[PDB]
Structure formats: structure tokens, C-alpha cells
Structure 1
Amino acid sequence: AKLHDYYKDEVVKKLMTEFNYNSVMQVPRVEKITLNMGVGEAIADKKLLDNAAADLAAISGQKPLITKARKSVAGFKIRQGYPIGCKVTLRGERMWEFFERLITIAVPRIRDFRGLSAKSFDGRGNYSMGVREQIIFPEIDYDKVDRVRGLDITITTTAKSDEEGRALLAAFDFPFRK
């Protein structure tokens, strides 16, 4: 593990040179990465969610758990906390464990891209990267590609503005450009 150690020394610890604070403890931090994988056309049975979560847990270090629904989804018979997908939310060391597998070894299904925008916005500085699939990691034999399954990513941080979060964006090796 090297990328979280880079976050402990090389990221925002000199930010007082560019951003105004009353304490050096105000510099921005990463809180969580929620994640999402959609059940798609299996929504009306969804007993496969345990078997889909188990293969997200093949690139994540977390133990699988199943997403409960909110406000229902369409007319598919979704009621209260009905199990409907997977998040398997990342905190602490597990966030950068994943960002040392993502587009380092998990590569053979990526799309044509070269750099995501740094001047992007939400109002707090919480960045996102479009990937659509779990993009596959290579094994000694596979025999693993049939549908690959989905992936969505948006970070959550202590930042109060989009240019404060632009200094925290330094926390990753993913292609972002100024």
C-alpha cells in the first residue's frame, strides 16, 4: 500500500499557502466513497445479489452486504427496504486499496479517455469518475467475462467549495488534468 501513504505526506499539508484558515486543522479530508452496482434485469428475483456482491468483493477488500431500496423503484414490486443492488461503501485504508487496483491492473475494458476535468463542480468539491463497468482484473485463467457488472464512483469530503476539493483531488493517480 503506497497511495494512502502519499495522502499522509504529499496532499494538502501545505495548503495554507493558497487557502485562508484560522487553524491548519481545517484542511480538507476524504470521508467515504459510497459506490454502486445495479441489479439490472434480475430485479424481480434478485437472489443473485449475494453472488454479484461476492465478485465486487473480488476487487474490494470489504465484506459484501446488499443495498436496501429507497422510495421504491418503478413498478417492479419494490417494498420498504427491499434488497436491490450493491454499494459496499469504502472508508479509511480500503478507499486507497481500491485506487491501487483501479486502472493499475483493472484495465482491459476501459474506454477512450486521457484526462478528467479539474474545474468540475458540485458546491463542496466532491469529485466523480465515469467507469460504467467493473472493467476486469486479469487472472492466470479466465473464464470470467460474460457481463462484468456495473460500477459508479463519487467521493465525499470535508471541503466547503469546489476549488478547496481541487486541492484534495491530488489524493489519487487517476487521470485528472488542470
Structure 2
Amino acid sequence: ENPMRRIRIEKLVLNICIGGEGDALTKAAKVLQQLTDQEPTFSKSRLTIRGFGIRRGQKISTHVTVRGEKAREIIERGLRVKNFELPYSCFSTTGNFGFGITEHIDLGIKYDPSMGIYGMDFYVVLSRPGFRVNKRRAQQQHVGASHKITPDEARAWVEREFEVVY
């Protein structure tokens, strides 16, 4: 029951893979910025594929990493769009989980013709105090199996914090 065993959201990543249009990607950046109050980053394409209509190095996506209150405030709005219903399978082996919503209108953004509907995938990463051991530059060592979040431990904390039904 150590306070250091408490599970907290590490962060929320909201990615919008529009494709090779370019025009839509800037508009998605604007939608992301209004939700998070921080500049989004653009992700280049690794290879080129005609089926996706993308050439290598074309900016093809937009993402933001939000931590703190802004993280769970945004996550709650996304969960409301799915009526607090989660797939159960959505929990990863490492204890993270994701939503994925179609449309930006539901998150409370106001529809405008300049930015058309842009769905995004919400990924929530679940941490605990002491996971810095794997991310520090000096003396980086892997977290212990005990302190790593089991998939079951993730489901239990999200059911307490968000009342979700699987």
C-alpha cells in the first residue's frame, strides 16, 4: 500500500494520421492545438506507398503529448464520446490503454468548414512513481516486474477514476 505504488496517467498522445493531403494536416494541427494549448508535432512518412498515397518524408500525421490535469480532462471528454465504454481487450501488456474516436466535434470543438471532421486515436500511458529509472540519462536500469503495471492493475485504476464499464 506504498504511496509510491500509486498508478498515475503518465501522458496522453493524440495522433491524427490524415494521409498525404498536407492541407488537412495543418487543419488537424489547429484542432489539436485548441484541445491541448501546446504546439503539435508533424510526423514524416518512413517509406512511400501508393495505396496510402504518401511519399517518403511527406508530413503525414500530427501528435501531441499532454501530461497533468490537461491529460485527464481531455481523456474524460473522449471517454464521454464512447459513454465510458471500453473494449477490455484495449488494455496492453504494459498496462497502457487507448480509445480512438471518429470526429473532433464530440470533444466539444465547434464544427467549422475550414477544419472538417478529424478523428484521432487517444493513447493513455499508465505510470507509477519510480518509472524514471528507465528514462534517466545516468544509471538507467529497467523497472522491476513488481513495479511495472499489470494489464489487470490498469483496468482496476481506470474503473475507479473514470467508472468505465468493459
1:122 and 2:79 correspond: no
For residues 172 and 24 of structure 1, the distance between their equivalents in structure 2, rounded to whole angstroms, comes to 16
Query: Taking structure 1 as the reference length, what is the TM-score of the superposition?
Result: 0.62
Deviation string 1:107-131 (CA, Å, 9 cap, x unpaired) is xxx57x6632457532122122231
Q: Which one-letter code corresponds to 2:165 in the other structure?
A: R
- 1:88 Cα deviation after fit: 1.7
1:25 and 2:25 correspond: no
Deviation string 1:54-104 (CA, Å, 9 cap, x unpaired) is 1222222222332233x3252435224x31111122122320242354466
1:77-116 to structure 2, matched below 5 A, reads: 77-80=54-57, 82-99=58-75, 101-102=77-78, 110=81, 115-116=85-86
For residues 91 and 114 of structure 1, the distance between their equivalents in structure 2, rounded to whole angstroms, comes to 21
Q: What is the match of residue 142 of structure 2?
A: none
Match for residue 154 of structure 1 among 123, 135, 148 = 123
For residues 60 and 26 of structure 2, the distance between their equivalents in structure 1, rounded to whole angstroms, comes to 11
Structure 1 gaps, min length 5 = 1-15, 17-22, 105-109
CA RMSD of aligned residues (A): 3.2
- 1:149 Cα deviation after fit: 0.9
Question: Contact 1:50–1:66 (CA<8 Å) still a contact in 2?
Answer: no
CA 1:128/1:85 → structure 2, altered by over 3 Å: closer, same or farther?
Answer: same
Runs ≥4 residues deviating over 6 A = none
Q: Which one-letter code corresponds to 2:158 in the other structure?
A: L
Higher helix share: 2
Percent identity over the alignment is 27
1:52 and 2:22 correspond: no
- 1:177 Cα deviation after fit: 1.3
For residues 10 and 104 of structure 2, the distance between their equivalents in structure 1, rounded to whole angstroms, comes to 22
Equivalent residue pairs, number: 143
